[PDB]
Amino acid sequence: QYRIIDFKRDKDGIPGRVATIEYDPNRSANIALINYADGEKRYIIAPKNLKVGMEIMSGPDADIKIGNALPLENIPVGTLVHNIELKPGRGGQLVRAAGTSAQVLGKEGKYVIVRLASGEVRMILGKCRATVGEVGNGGRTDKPFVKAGNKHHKMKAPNVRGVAMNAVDHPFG
Amino acid sequence: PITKEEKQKVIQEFARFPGDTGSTEVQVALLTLRINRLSEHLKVHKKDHHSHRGLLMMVGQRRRLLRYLQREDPERYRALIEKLGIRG
RNA sequence: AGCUAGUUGGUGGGGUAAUGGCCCACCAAGGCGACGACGGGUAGCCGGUCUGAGAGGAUGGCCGGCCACAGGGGCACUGA
RNA sequence: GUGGGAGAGGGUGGUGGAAUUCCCGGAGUAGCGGUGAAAUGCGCAGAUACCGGGAGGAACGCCGAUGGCGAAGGCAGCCACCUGGUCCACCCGUGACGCUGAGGCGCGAAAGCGUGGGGAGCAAACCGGAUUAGAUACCCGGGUAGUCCACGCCCUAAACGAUGCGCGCUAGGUCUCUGGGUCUCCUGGGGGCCGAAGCUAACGCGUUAAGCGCGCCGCCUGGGGAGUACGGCCGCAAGGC
RNA sequence: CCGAGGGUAGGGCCCGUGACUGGGGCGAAGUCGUAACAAGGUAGCUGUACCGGAAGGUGCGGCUGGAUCACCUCCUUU
RNA sequence: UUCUAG
RNA sequence: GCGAGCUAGCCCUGGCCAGGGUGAAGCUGGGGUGAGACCCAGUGGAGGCCCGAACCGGUGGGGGAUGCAAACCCCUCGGAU
RNA sequence: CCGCAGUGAACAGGCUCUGGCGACUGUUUACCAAAAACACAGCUCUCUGCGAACUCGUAAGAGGAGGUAUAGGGAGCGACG
RNA sequence: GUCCUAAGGUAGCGAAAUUCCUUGUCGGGUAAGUUCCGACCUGCACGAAAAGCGUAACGACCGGAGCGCUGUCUCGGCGAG
Structure with a gap:
């Protein structure tokens, strides 16, 4: 419903309980309200799995318990993640419903290796974080916009195209 | 899997006479029990076509x-069906 | 490879020598089929006839029985 | 029933080296690689070979076998999870509960298609090099779809033992595996080989029958046109019945 | 009311039938090539896929109705 | 590599 | 310098589409198999979906040409959650 | 029972057979042209790892996007087969 | 058999809205048909990506034909405002 919310933990020792299935319409991410100890909440990432009955978190410590997330430092090798913590705390550093996250495919000193979900590879840094678990996007692909144009229903630009025009109009155009 | 003492509690259950180790009452009870944790096994493991044919x-x-x-x-056939619950 | 509206049965009833959905009313819907129904192709069916070691093949014009048609298509009369 | 036993039957997850090709560093030359002999090709921007490191699929050497499992196709590095079939011994339990099976219903090579990953190597197509008369093929150097997996679709084939299933009767010698026994051998299953009776037109089958008898099945019935045309069912189509 | 017959329309089963075109069979014999039986010269056949004046070829799978010792590993036994 | 039919 | 009370857009915030028709997901029940596939029947009510007012339009013909008008009248037509 | 007529008047598809292009509802050249023109749902190459890449901008800055490679921009075709 | 080129048009299609010689030649439709529609195909100059062959439904798109029906027409002739 035209809004944002959470995207980056950094208060820990906190109790992570899988709020609920609030599959969400606004970023290809499907998240559920994450119930913290105090009671303070957050429509959190959609890293598939972690059943309703919440039951997680993270921590400077550890707990690969699927989903969840800590610094690079605190992370296995051969592991699949998201909550792409690029720079030191820059919260998320990639993978948006981009299921196929990154896989600490080898780390090095204040530098941890990452399979570039998108489609390449290089390294991050020290404390830098990132929570494993999948994504959530049920292949959020495909699906037919049949005899109409989902598009429009887009609210998402018919910013339509052209290219053939009659003129000689717009940038590199 | 099927436990040995589970098998006996089933044989004891269906026997009309103390010592019914093999009879219509036992066969069906065995086969039906073997039918419900083999089919249960095939729902996950979708493609176990060798053990599906051996089930059939x-x-x-x-x-x-x-x-x-x-x-x-x-x-006693109406008594055997209802008790188990097969046919529909 | 599906077939069916008089179609399957019933109540009453017309008509007929009289049975019968045979024709009609009203009622409920069933009746059929691979143990080949519906459709298509073709046809006079038999006693007998020709052949055959035979079982079985063919065939059934004149003599005989039952049947059909009277140029094609129907209907009624008189009337046992 | 019970009590053992074997196996690459299956399907889910997981790990294990061996090497393969690409990538970063070391070292270190001038040639490599390749055939019937060459050539195309790589390489002085330093390749091939060796050292070390990496990443990645994909199979799975020796054991492994003329051996094993399985309804058919077909199935092999170890792991555990569900699970099928199938075999000796006790002779305990039911009590003829059976044997065949139109159609169906399910499986089911490999090619292929549908979408979604992945692509080390192999490899039609296509590309060069050779070749001869000619080279659209053999031979050499490249390389794509596929081959890989999930999921759904095709179901065809020298799908082979070219040979339905069941039980029961008719000498044997011999190799091997599995299960039991008084375990110099007898026993029940299973696999290879020789060989009496017998069948055969011919080879050859021969208690693993192509012998002798009983059920129930499918298929035959001159060669081409044909396994095709037409009607019908089925597939996204290539086709397929 | 039922109905012989006549009409307009709609479909179904079939015979004829056509420019043209796919193939199939004959026919003295024609051209171009070697596919096939001796490893027919690359052994052949096959499901399929692509490609090639044409026989065919190459790939994935396989069946031998494939066979020699022109070579290796050994096997199996007195 | 090819060389008809009787 | 001057302008989106022209018009093309874009942001924010309200209002508006008389009636009718077609009948997919679903859920209920029944249906030969192990569960099912899956069938059917009921319910059900989607779709830039159909038939059409207002409303949006302005092909196809008619008039008009110092018009009613610097684009309008007439018959006609498309769209119609 | 009645008239030539019984939606009695009034509002109310002519249908069919075929072909070509573009699939389709559309959108557009206000005052000629609504079309085989653009638009598309859909495909393919593709630049981009963020403080993105391209667009405005004299330097800030906004956009992008509080998006983050099932994503954002560049594109030639424009179901599906 | 060759001379040149980087190779030197492949599958589908074809007088198509790319074919002027042309109302091309054969076929059907007709009392005759230079429009159509099928087929050949010597494609004056199609062709796979500004896709290529086809394609149910879909179109105020364009072109071809049949019934149904009417002053559109065989000259109309009357009338109402």
């Missing part, structure tokens, strides 16, 4: 034993 033989083994008891005494 056993499916046909049941029915023919069932056939016999209706052929002789359909009175």
Whole structure:
């Protein structure tokens, strides 16, 4: 419903309980309200799995318990993640419903290796974080916009195209 | 899997007479039990087509034993079906 | 490879020598089929006839029985 | 029933080296690689070979076998999870509960298609090099779809033992595996080989029958046109019945 | 009311039938090539896929109705 | 590599 | 310098589409198999979906040409959650 | 029972057979042209790892996008087969 | 058999809205048909990506034909405002 919310933990020792299935319409991410100890909440990432009955978190410590997330430092090798913590705390550093996250495919000193979900590879840094678990996007692909144009229903630009025009109009155009 | 003491509590359950180690009452009870944790196994493991075919033989083994008891005494056949719960 | 509206049965009833959905009313819907129904192709069916070691193949014009048609298509009369 | 036993039957997850090709560093030359002999090709921007490191699929050497499992196709590095079939011994339990099976219903090589990953190597197509008369093929150097997996679709084939299933009767010698026994051998299953009776037109089958008898099945019935045309069912189509 | 017959329309089963075109069979014999039986010269046949004046070829699978010792590993036994 | 039919 | 009370857009915030028709997901029940596939029947009510007012339009013909008018009148037509 | 007529008047598809292009509802050249023109749902190459890449901007800055490679921009075709 | 080129048009299609010689030649439709529609195909100059062959439904799109029906027409002739 035209809004944002959470995207980056950094208060820990906190109790992570899988709020609920609030599959969400606004970023290809499907998240559920994450119930913290105090009671303070957050429509959190959609890293598939972690059943309703919440039951997680993270921590400077550890707990690969699927989903969840800590610094690079605190992370296995051969592991699949998201909550792409690029720079030191820059919260998320990639993978948006981009299921196929990154896989600490080898780390090095204040530098941890990452399979570039998108489609390449290089390294991050020290404390830098990132929570494993999948994504959530049920292949959020495909699906037919049949005899109409989902598009429009887009609210998402018919910013339509052209290219053939009659003129000689717009940038590199 | 099927436990050995589970098998006996089933054999004891269905026996009309203390010592019924093999009879219509036991066969069907065995085969039906073997039918419900083999089919349960095939729902996950979608493609176990070798053990599915070996199940279907056993499916046909049941029915023919069932056939016999209706052929002789359909009175205890209505008692055997309801108790188990097969046919619909 | 599906077939069916008089179609399957019933109540009453017309008509007929009189049975019968045979024709009609009203009622409920069933009746059929691979143990080949519906459709298509073709046809006079038999006693007998020709052949055959035979079982079985063919065939059934004149003599005989039952049947059909009277140029094609129907209907009624008189009337046992 | 019970009590053992074997196996690459299956399907889910997981790990294990061996090497393969690409990538970063070391070292270190001038040639490599390749055939019937060459050539195309790589390489002085330093390749091939060796050292070390990496990443990645994909199979799975020796054991492994003329051996094993399985309904058919077909199935092999170890792991555990569900699970099928199938075999000796006790002779305990039911009590003829059976044997065949139109149609169906399910499986089911490999090619292929549908979408979604992945692509080390192999490899039609296509590309060069050779070749001869000619080279659209053999031979050499490249390389794409596929081959890989999930999921759904095709179901065809020298799908082979070219040979339905069941039981029961008719000498044997011999190799091997599995299960039991008084375990110099007898026993029940299973696999290879020789060989009496017998069948055969011919080879050859021969208690693993192509012998002798009983059920129930499918298929035959001159060669081409044909396994095709037409009607019908089925597939996204290539086709397929 | 039922109905012989006549009409307009709609479909179904079939015979004829056509420019043209796919193939199939004959026919003295024609051209171009070697596919096939001796490893027919690359052994052949096959499901399929692509490609090639044409026989065919190459790939994935396989069946031998494939066979020699022109070579290796050994096997199996007195 | 090819060389008809009787 | 001057302008989106022209018009093309874009942001924010309200209002508006008389009636009718077609009948997919679903859920209920029944249906030969192990569960099912899956069938059917009921309910059900989607779709830039159909038939059409207002409303949006302005092909196809008619008039008009110092018009009613610097684009309008007439018959006609498309769209119609 | 009645008239030539019984939606009696009034509002109310002519249908069919075929072909070509573009699939389709559309959108557009206000005052000629609504079309085989653009638009598309859909495909393919593709630049981009963020403080993105391209667009405005004299330097800030906004956009992008509080998006983050099932994504954002560049594109030639424009179901599906 | 060759001379040149980087190879030197492949599958589908074809007088198509790319074919002027042309109302091309054969076929059907007709009392005759230079429009159509099928087929050949010597494609004056199609062709796979500004896709290529086809394609149910879909179109105020364009072109071809049949019934149904009417002053559109065989000259109309009357009338109402």
